[model samples]
Target: FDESFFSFGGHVGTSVEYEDKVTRGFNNTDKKEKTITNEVFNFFYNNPQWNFMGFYSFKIENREQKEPGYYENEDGIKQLFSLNKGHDLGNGWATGLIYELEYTRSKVYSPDVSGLRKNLAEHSIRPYLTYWNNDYNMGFYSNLEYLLSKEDRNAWGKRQEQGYSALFKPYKRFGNWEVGVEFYYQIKTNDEKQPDGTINEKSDFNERYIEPIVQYSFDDAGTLYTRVRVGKNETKNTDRSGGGNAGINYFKDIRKATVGYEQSIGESWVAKAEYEYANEVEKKSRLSGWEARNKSELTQHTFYAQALYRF
Candidate 1:
């Protein structure tokens, strides 16, 4: 079902960002920002039934201006490790289990919030089943994770909780093109406690997403990958009343489109580019009349380009 091998590789890249309204202000000036990142190290081992991998990444971003006097510089470091094992059940059926851990820390600069620091740690376990037939492929998987810990020196400590997520993907290959559908769902399992000693069981933290994809690849040209997603995202505390008086429900419909391309530059290098567009609009509802007046709406477009070398 698989081969055995050991490999080491790394990547480095930079990106520039242009925003029409940096602070979402209609009259405010736009801003340009730049980000640089280096994944300095990556180590991995793979066998017919087991695999292990890890990596370390460093990133920094600089902006001309940020929200009157908030922050303009941000830097972070991330480290991750994962292990997996799989079994082949014959007839193109297989099952696997994976465990992963991630940790990150960042320093931010701003006016009243200048030099603020934050840290986060997460652990996840996933098990999946996969089936393959000549031109058809499918998979089902479940992810369970714990917010082992989180720290924000500026604000109260972050919430520590557990979450569950599920994913399903089915795809078919026709000639040089592949078509696929993906569905995902996630929910938080733990209730949060407020400083006022109130326990809140917010179910709105759950999310659902569906995406359809079409990809084409050929030696004559670079690969083209395209995807469109539709989803719903809910608010944590729509009511804020604590009394749970019919508790206002707030949610939004999210729509997104993405296009990506990758081509080999040489025997040991590759180049990539991607563009993404997304919009989130509040769902109309009578119970959540205040949702219509919220000012945090977002309509975003982003572009990414990078080059990588392998050894």
Candidate 2:
């Protein structure tokens, strides 16, 4: 394969998810989401001095709900950008910055039930600073996530939220083998409101999302990677709307583990495959203590294969 100066490519993949849940004072439920598909258009620039990358993705989700028995479909768009540059600091260290931005927007259908993803919008940003002179290269920085959009009032149905996070990232490169980890400490806030923007309640949130990755590169043109994602969340709600002396708290655990393989097929193509599993849990507790009530958990598996063409 000949080295190219710039590359433009695209990919398509699909996955399915199944969830089972139980909550106190409620009926047990299990839902299967089928044929979750995504298509991405990407551009990349890679060189010895600096690098930049960008992509836009459109995703579709389809599902069926029972009792009355109906089907649902959803769509959204995601865009992201990354830029990295370096400056020479003192003492044999190359200090650099990595800037990243991701924004997402969703469409709400007419007569949309389930009150899910009604005109949702979310944005994330990370500005990392790194210095490297040895086998270890480390970086730090983080995100602000928002869900701010609404439609017709479903009885003051949902909440608008913002998340703030601090991240510590470390990676080790030893020739063809690499190891990396991500730890994010997050705090978020929310407002419960209707379509007219009248706030009825307030909430505070806590979450942890961690991922560790290991990859090996072939001498010719391929890579094998294994990764683990550990996720958790906690929240405190204070909604004394009709009046109360206290509120509620919740804790959730969500984990995703994946294994991946990729290869360069020819001068203009690449192939990749992945298998991932996620186990999730949610619980509610009294504001005074963790002696809890109400519970829900889920396990899901996904297999994704992708093919890309570059020119």
Model 1, position 215: C-alpha lDDT score? 95
Q: Tens digit of lDDT per residue, candidate 1, span 1-311?
A: 22234343434333333332222332233333434444444444444323333333343433344454443676777677777677777887777777777777777765556666767677877777777785354443334333333343345234455777788888887788888888888776433445454544433467799999999998687799999999997655545334352354557788889999988877767778888887766532333342324434456676766666645
| Cα-based RMSD of candidate 1 | 5.2
lDDT of each: 0.60, 0.58
Candidate 2 clash pair list: none
- The residue-by-residue lDDT of candidate 2 on 60-85, one tens digit each, is 44433332243444455655555655
Alpha-carbon runs more than 4 Å astray in model 2: 1-26, 45-53, 60-72, 76-117, 135-158, 196-201, 240-246, 286-293
Give every collision pair in model 1. 70-110, 110-114
